[PDB]
Curated annotation (Swiss-Prot), chain A:
Organism encoding this protein: Neisseria gonorrhoeae (strain ATCC 700825 / FA 1090)
Protein name per Swiss-Prot or TrEMBL: DNA mismatch repair protein MutS
Source species taxonomy: Bacteria, Pseudomonadati, Pseudomonadota, Betaproteobacteria, Neisseriales
HAMAP family noted in UniProt: MutS
Disulphide bridges: none
InterPro entries: DNA_mismatch_repair_MutS (IPR005748), DNA_mismatch_repair_MutS-lik_N (IPR007695), DNA_mismatch_repair_MutS/MSH (IPR017261), DNA_mismatch_repair_MutS_C (IPR000432), DNA_mismatch_repair_MutS_clamp (IPR007861), DNA_mismatch_repair_MutS_core (IPR007696), DNA_mismatch_repair_MutS_N (IPR016151), DNA_mismatch_repair_MutS_sf (IPR036187)
Length: 767, 771
């Protein structure tokens, strides 16, 4: 009535998606209308205009070009918005008549697989949360890696798990909590019945082809909330991608004991993967990122955030890096030459993979087959040595199937190799007819009338065609009109080449359709081959990060960390990993902590370097529990469960919490603010909780001198410092750890002489 | 050293002739359409400017390294080179016939070209002549005619250097020269150029007077600064094409005319520069509402130089009060004037181009239109009296130059029509150009039967008529023939040789004539330089005062009051920069007298302590500039200096080491948490002693923020001390800071931050109480 049909179908699509933007394919452009038009013209800086009227109202519209579409929608998912992409799709091929217009894929900021949308070091996780009483169900998955885990956690404390997962999207039900909102990033809201164990268990069991989830360690009475979260995640993944991915790892209940505990503020303080200044310059991940492959880098981040508590999964890693120190160079001088086969396997699983990825996967897998000689170690890398079966006709029948240099698009043509399919072969051999047959009928009927020079014509409107001039007019052999338009050199169509295009045009029309058919065919080889791909990518990444761990333990002085059953922290000539590269003249120090030497009270002037030492030992323990070595001569670490580090952030209060038989707690000058009285009191009580009163093992830096007397009260809490000297008219710090307290101090290089005999006086009323 | 010159080309020998005079600078050697540098200059410029390094010719067998820049881009590269502190001699060829000359030396501190200066950029060169007992300072700004001398000391030197922000520093070459940071471009000079007697001769010559008494100098005690000024004048003479006669007077600066502030204080107060060194909201940027560039520069100068003489301050304030009701059309008028100050500078140094005059005359007329615009009663009346006095210059310029002259004087069409009758007649031979050529071509078509001939021209052959070799054989002997081509053949004929010599001769005479007339009006302008400088200064001052009036009207500023007794009274004042960043800013009072001299500020970390102190210091600074202050009312006593500190730790001991034995009864001192570092024993000892120095041995009005609570008990030991703290309120398990000064020391509430805490918090509550 008062709406264009081309708007009626659009509304038919938009009706199903009022919770995300809709890219609507219009010619060589993607366009959005109405509120999508205003919102898209706002989030981006896109010209807003008008095209058409609905009920007598000029409908607004914004547009982007097709060539720059993935860039713009990549900017849209960086903003945390979802976009449904609506194309015109037809049955059989090229639409044997009709065309449908439907949403072919839905792009969400947490289900990303294309290299055009992801940074080559981005980790993309979608986490679903299902809350209720105390415990809450936590389930996360990464499409690009196949990761798919679950976990039970407590209501709030969830924020630390969220900052640990670094989620790019959160799935949430309705009613009650959880809160935070802007402490996550981009939250999409799903129906409550999606989070039902009373449906989730069924969906999961069907997905993995098993009778129960007890094999994955998930019972039904407990865990129910988390199996429901996993079910909701599975549903979302199904609704977003065009194929249901069959590459997901396999459910596992993550225990809150298999990794060392690090809260959000601790992960930010130590600068594991990002700075406090919101960047990626000097982070622990950056100065260790010597991975030849992107997947190895991302895995390096994963290990950097998840150091394990088990005294059996590390030292295996030590048995790898130790056995790699004499063979790591020819491994990276080989791993540098492969591509992101992890994301490639992903795109094959979801179904958004283009031929270039098949080619690159073929090559990188063949190069993965050329490791061979570099092998033989202990336990784990004996598994990695055997994990490459070359990957059989998955690597072999990939070069046999796909060309060395395939086309960019499957609709351009020519992707499958020559001599791979016979009917294909005979259906190609008309590429010489651009040099034959038409030359035959074009020279045999070249100027059978004259004059003059004769040319040929392809044209898109009309079929194959021939040339002519102005004054030269009606000189034809068939002649019978069927001619114009228009004027200025005239044209008469021929009746016998309309049987020539009748076979070459159809020749390509069945060549490309067939090529799509068997491209889908050898695109199906996933019934047995997809897990092979996942295992290949996993082991390749692991070898990359481990060999990188071997390069760093020889180019820089790193030593195998030893372990112990008794709570101990000792290390000789310990160095800070990221600061060691910033000065080119770092001073190695030691730590000396045991059951009777557990708390260290640090003192010293400012630019002396106590923060650097604290972060030094903390990062050293972290690296020791990763598998890599530590910057030292030797280091011994007992058992440890959590690491804590420290606008009156009481979050010191967080130092409580489940299982406090810790071994590492950092406190840097707690007391700044309020006053010296109440600040000193709080620093005193806080310092006393860290020994016997509830907890154990701490590095306590403070300027409070009236607190250096604490070793006189508790023998387990010792006191050390860092000093300064000069050997001249200016004070310099060489940054050496020295036992005992402060302080001179002093000094003063010109502070008159009427405030000096009180600076020495009041600093002698040290009651 | 036996040498060429069969191993060096004559051109290269010329270049070495110029280069031997400038072994310390880059030399731009004019080479056709380019400026080229050779040898080490070529290598250095290749590094610095990212231009490709190449080779031209050979010297002593070795290829000559060369690097060039195109003429049209030269300025751009110069702009880079002076931003790297580099000086460049500009070798051109001059003559009537030609010799190689330097014509101009571009240095970081003698800039007058708009291509090499930002709009709001001050360009100062300062020469220091050290005696050791005292140090003479002389600074000049060519773009403003600024010329001032001062006697300082070695310990107070870097404070002056930081005050002046000089782009270039002239030092003597002696081994006893003062060691210092480097900084800006440091240029060392043949020590003899700092001579006191020679400098006195140079000054008395430049100004046309008998002695330097009127300026307040004379050779006895100011000798070293006289030598500094002499070095400055000599350097200006070496570097500029023409010797500028626009340097205003020469005042000896005393320590008693401006409110003194050290380098650290200028940096911390963020007057014209942030602590991160930007224009991210500073005092200048927040207050810069000037309509002219010269006005903005003057505003920066004023913000760095608050006046001690209250009479001048009050003259300014009268001006802004009078400008309250009339600053809108004033700003509209001044907004359409150009940088006549820099114009006068380029005229002075002999670097003005025709369109510069085309801006000077127009903006001078637009300034003459302000005679209405405003009235009133103050120093304003002098300012208004200045503008109509400069109308004659605008008239002579309206008569002498075109409404829009050409860019280059070498192209003619710069001198106006009707200004010179001989030029009008020489320029009149132009219809006789195209017209005669029509009355010739048409008289050759019918005469040769060829519509295939036109009169053509090139710079090599002149005018000619060309015919194809087919038609060439049929040409008359009336034609004369020259160039032999392939298809055609060119011919002149004496009836267009008379024409050719006629019009080309007229062109040359016209060009030379415009050259000499434009030069004439340039000499006249340079004689009118004092009135031009008065016009520029009057415009800039009026623009700054208009800006102050506008700020007071639109931001609720009030005229501060001045008292004869030590007092700082601010009825809820505001921080001028922070106030435009918070949507809501809480104003706060300040009551200080001889009995209340030291405020001991305490409290949490987000109660506006530092902002309050900076607010007080900034209102006192603004008070002595003529600008109205952000408050309901204010009253400040006699102030001499403003000290502040708002990494560690000897830098703290250094700044305090400056404050304790320099601050006086009239000083305003700001201390922000002194003691951070070392420990809480020694730091509290130092904070204690430092505090008991401002009330006692230098009765300065001090704001002293700290977290040492034991310093709270000073009002119970000193009548001068008082306790104030800033507000913190609990309204819903959540801390808020309403930022309000309250008498007293905030009490104890760090334990009260138990709003998110778990103890066993009594172990702290058992440490305090403890008295
Ligand atoms: N062992 C070391 N070797 C060399 N430089 C160091 C060392 N430890 C610290 N530094 C340097 O000393 C400076 C002060 O570091 P910081 O830990 O902040 O001191 P503090 O914590 O005592 O205030 C840093 O810039 C760092 O570069
Ligand atoms: N009067 C005020 N009105 C509004 N905001 C203020 C005011 N004073 C301070 N603030 C804000 O409070 C913050 C803390 O200022 P600051 O004075 O540095 O606290 P402290 O001195 O306790 O360290 C600043 O970011 C400032 O913007």
């Amino acid at each position: 009535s008062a709406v264009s049909p081309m708007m009626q179908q659009y509304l038919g699509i938009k009706a199903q998606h009022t919770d995300k933007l809709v890219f609507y394919r219009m010619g060589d452009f993607y366009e959005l209308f109405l509120d999508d038009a205003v919102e898209a013209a706002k989030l981006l800086d896109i010209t807003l205009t008008t095209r058409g009227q609905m009920d007598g109202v000029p409908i607004k519209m914004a547009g982007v070009p097709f060539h720059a579409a993935e860039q713009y929608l990549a900017r849209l998912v960086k903003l945390g918005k979802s976009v449904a992409i609506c194309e015109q799709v037809g049955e059989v091929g090229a639409g044997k008549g009709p065309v449908e217009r439907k949403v072919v894929r839905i792009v969400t900021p947490g289900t990303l697989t294309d290299s055009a949308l992801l940074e080559d070091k981005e980790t993309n996780r979608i986490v679903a949360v299902s809350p209720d009483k105390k415990y809450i169900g936590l389930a996360w998955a990464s499409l690009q890696s196949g990761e798919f885990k679950t976990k039970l956690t407590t209501a709030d404390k969830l924020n630390d798990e969220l900052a640990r997962l670094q989620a790019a999207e959160i799935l949430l039900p309705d009613s009650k909590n959880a809160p935070q909102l802007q402490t996550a990033s981009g939250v999409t809201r799903l129906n409550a019945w999606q989070f039902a164990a009373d449906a989730g268990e069924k969906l999961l069991t069907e997905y993995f082809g098993c009778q129960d989830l007890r094999g994955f360690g998930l019972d039904s009475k407990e865990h129910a909330v988390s199996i429901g979260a996993a079910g909701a995640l599975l549903n979302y993944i199904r609704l977003t991608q065009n194929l249901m991915p069959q590459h997901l790892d396999g459910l596992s209940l993550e225990t809150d004991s298999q990794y060392i505990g690090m809260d959000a503020a601790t992960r930010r303080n130590l600068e594991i993967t990002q700075t406090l200044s919101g960047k990626k310059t000097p982070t622990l991940f950056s100065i260790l990122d010597g991975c030849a492959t992107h997947m190895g880098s991302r895995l390096l981040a994963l290990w950097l955030h998840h150091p394990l508590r088990n005294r059996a999964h590390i030292r295996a890693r030590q048995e790898a890096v130790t056995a790699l120190e004499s063979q790591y160079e020819p491994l990276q001088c080989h791993l540098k030459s492969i591509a992101d086969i992890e994301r490639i396997a992903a795109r094959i699983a979801v179904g958004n993979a283009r031929p270039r990825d098949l080619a690159s996967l073929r090559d990188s897998l063949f190069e993965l087959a050329q490791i061979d000689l570099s092998a033989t170690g202990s336990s784990l890398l004996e598994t990695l040595k055997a994990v490459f079966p070359e990957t059989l006709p998955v690597a072999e029948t990939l070069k046999a199937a796909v060309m060395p240099e395939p086309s960019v698009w499957l609709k351009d043509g020519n992707v499958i190799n020559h001599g791979f399919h016979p009917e294909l072969d005979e259906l190609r051999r008309i590429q010489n007819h651009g040099d034959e047959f038409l030359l035959d009928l074009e020279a045999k009927e070249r100027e059978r009338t004259g004059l003059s020079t004769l040319k040929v014509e392809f044209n898109r409107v009309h079929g194959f065609y021939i040339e002519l001039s102005k004054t030269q007019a009606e000189q034809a052999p068939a002649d019978y009109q069927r001619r114009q338009t228009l004027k200025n050199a005239e044209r008469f169509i021929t009746p016998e080449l309309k049987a020539f295009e009748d076979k070459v045009l159809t020749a390509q029309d069945q060549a490309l359709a067939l090529e799509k058919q068997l491209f889908d065919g050898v695109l199906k080889n996933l019934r047995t081959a997809l897990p092979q791909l996942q295992k290949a990518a996993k082991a390749a990444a692991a070898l990359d990060v481990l060999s990188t761990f071997s390069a760093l333990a020889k180019e820089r002085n790193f030593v195998r960390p030893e372990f112990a059953d008794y709570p101990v922290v000792h290390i000789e000539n310990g160095r800070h990993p990221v600061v060691e590269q910033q000065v080119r003249h770092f001073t190695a120090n030691h730590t000396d902590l045991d059951h009777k030497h557990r708390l260290m009270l640090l003192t010293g002037p400012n630019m002396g370097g106590k923060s650097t030492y604290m972060r030094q030992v903390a990062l050293i323990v972290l690296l020791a529990h990763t598998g890599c070595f530590v910057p030292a001569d030797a280091a011994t670490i007992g058992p440890v469960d959590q690491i804590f580090t420290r606008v009156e952030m009481s979050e010191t209060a967080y130092i409580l919490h489940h299982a406090t038989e810790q071994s590492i707690v950092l406190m840097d000058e707690v007391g700044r603010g309020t006053s010296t009285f109440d600040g000193l009191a709080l620093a005193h009580a806080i310092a006393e909780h860290l020994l016997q009163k509830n907890k154990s093992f701490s590095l306590f830096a403070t300027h409070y001198f009236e607190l250096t007397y604490l070793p006189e009260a508790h023998a387990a809490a010792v006191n050390m410092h860092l000093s300064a000297l000069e050997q001249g008219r200016d004070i310099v710090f060489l940054h050496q750890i020295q036992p005992g307290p402060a302080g001179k101090s002093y000094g003063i290089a010109v502070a008159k002489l009427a405030g000096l005999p009180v600076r020495a006086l009041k600093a002698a009323q040290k009651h």
